[PDB]
Amino acid sequence: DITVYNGQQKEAATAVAKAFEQETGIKVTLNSGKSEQLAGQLKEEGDKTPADVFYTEQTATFADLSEAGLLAPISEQTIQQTAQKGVPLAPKKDWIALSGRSRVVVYDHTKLSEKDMEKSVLDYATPKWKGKIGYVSTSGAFLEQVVALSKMKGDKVALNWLKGLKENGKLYAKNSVALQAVENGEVPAALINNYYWYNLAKEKGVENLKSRLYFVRHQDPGALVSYSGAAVLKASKNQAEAQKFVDFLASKKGQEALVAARAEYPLRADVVSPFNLEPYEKLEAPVVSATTAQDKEHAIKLIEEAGL
Ligand SMILES: O=C(O)CN(CCN(CC(=O)O)CC(=O)O)CC(=O)O
Ligand SMILES: [Fe+3]
Numbered sequence: 001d002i003t004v005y006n007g008q009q010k011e012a013a014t015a016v017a018k019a020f021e022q023e024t025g026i027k028v029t030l031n032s033g034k035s036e037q038l039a040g041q042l043k044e045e046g047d048k049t050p051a052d053v054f055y056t057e058q059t060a061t062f063a064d065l066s067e068a069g070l071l072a073p074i075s076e077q078t079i080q081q082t083a084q085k086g087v088p089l090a091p092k093k094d095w096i097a098l099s100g101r102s103r104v105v106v107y108d109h110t111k112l113s114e115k116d117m118e119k120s121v122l123d124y125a126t127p128k129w130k131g132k133i134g135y136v137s138t139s140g141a142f143l144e145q146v147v148a149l150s151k152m153k154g155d156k157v158a159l160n161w162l163k164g165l166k167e168n169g170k171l172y173a174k175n176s177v178a179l180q181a182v183e184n185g186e187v188p189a190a191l192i193n194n195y196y197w198y199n200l201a202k203e204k205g206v207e208n209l210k211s212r213l214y215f216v217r218h219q220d221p222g223a224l225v226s227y228s229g230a231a232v233l234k235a236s237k238n239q240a241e242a243q244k245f246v247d248f249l250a251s252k253k254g255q256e257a258l259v260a261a262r263a264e265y266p267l268r269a270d271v272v273s274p275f276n277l278e279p280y281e282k283l284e285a286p287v288v289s290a291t292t293a294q295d296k297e298h299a300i301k302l303i304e305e306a307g308l
Contacts, residue, residue, distance in 0.1 A: 001027035002052040002241050005042065007035025008228055013055055015261030020248045026241050035061040036293075043068055047235045052242035055249075059088055059229040060290035062095040071095055072232040072239060074246055081250040082267035086285050088227055095231035098249050099264035102283055103145055103224045105214040106182050106197050107189040117189075117214040121145070121222025122157065124191065125164025134178040134190030135169045137308045141193050141226060146299040148224045148288045155302065162306030171308075182211045189214075191222075195263035198275040202263070217284040225285035228264060 006013040010032055017028035033041075035056040042049055042065055054071075056062065065071050071094035079096050083089060087097050105117060105124065118124055124133045136142050149158035170187050172178035178190040179197060197213050216222040230249050232242040248254040255266040259273040265280040266273060 001029065002238055002245055003029045003031060003050050004053045004055050004245070005038045005051045006030045006032040007038050007054070007056040007058070007061065009057065009262060012258060012262040012264070016055075016249060016254055016257045019254060019257035020245055023248060023253055024244060026244065028245065039064055042070060042233065045235075046070070049233055049235050051233050052236040052238050053230055053232055053245055055228075055230045057101075057226070057228045058291070059095060059097050059227045060292070062090065062229065062231050063290050063292065065231065066090065066092055066094050070234055072234045072236070072242070074232065075243065078247045078250045084267055084269060084280055086225075086281070086287060087267055088290065095229055096246060096250060097227040097229040097267060098255070099228045099258055099262075099266055100225040100280060100283075100285070101141070101228075101264055102194040102215070102226075102285070103141060103222055104192060104194045104197065105189055105216070105222070106179055106192050106211050107214055108182050108185065108210050109212045110210050111185075111188040114214055117216075119216055119218070120220050121191070121216055122149075122153070122161055124189070125161045125168060127168060129189070130168040131170065132188050133165070133169045134172050134181055134187045134192075135165050136172050136175050136178055136190075136192065137165070137303060138173065139175055141175075141224075142191070143296060143299050143303075144226055144291055145191075145221065145224055146302060147291050147295045148286065149221045150295075150299060150302070151288055152221050152286060155298075158299075159302050159306060162302055162308060166307045179211065183209065185210075194265075194277070195275075198263035198277060202275050215278075215283060217282070219284050219286040221286060223283055223285050224288065225265070225280075225283060227267075
């Protein structure tokens, strides 16, 4: 049996842990928390950690741990199972990306069509979209988007985008609220993440929704994907089962379990999501370095400078 420090949404983690317990008979104990906190705890615990695996919604949180020498290598063969072009790879082969969440534009298809959409996320923050674009400045993925803009286009472009949203956008407290605002006709489009919409569509039926999704693609900053993943702790005294679990997560079966539980894009190329997601490769996500604490601090400063 293994102990998994879990920064991923509890529902997803519970699902893969059960499919694992069923393929193998090995019990998983999930210890859930925020990935940044869990990473801090793993670093502090060091060679005395009881964690076998760290399962996260954000592979960026592995960087501090890898840099501290706290992660074990994963089999090359396992890493390759999800190594689609675009997918972040651990330079030390000491963690693996497993699935992704995407930025997206949700829009009310009774008011806008795909031909009205902007091909760059930068262009939603402009006067064409005055009063017409929702955004969620407190959201984690919004912050990731700002970080990506700063990295890809520079801080001035990122700040200008934020000021453009301040002037032209409608602020919503949460992605779910923004999605409902589009559905209810309050705003014709909003910047959210994919999984809110796919969840709503799965539950209610797309035939009963006014909203649709527009993906900018072509490695635009707005095609940003945030990657979930897993790592084995170097200090684990149960390497064999820890590795078995990570191997399972990258297996067809483990990926099938994840995608049934949460509308993340699987990174295997032979798994289709019951949420009816497009294949990961079609997203054309940009390649962006991992978000650091420093990156986040800088992005928060830009949000404040923009008046948000
Ligand atoms: O709790 C929230 O406010 C939204 N989140 C978690 C935050 N997000 C990113 C975002 O909504 O911007 C998912 C994640 O970071 O893993 C719950 C969910 O996505 O199910
Ligand atoms: Fe979310």
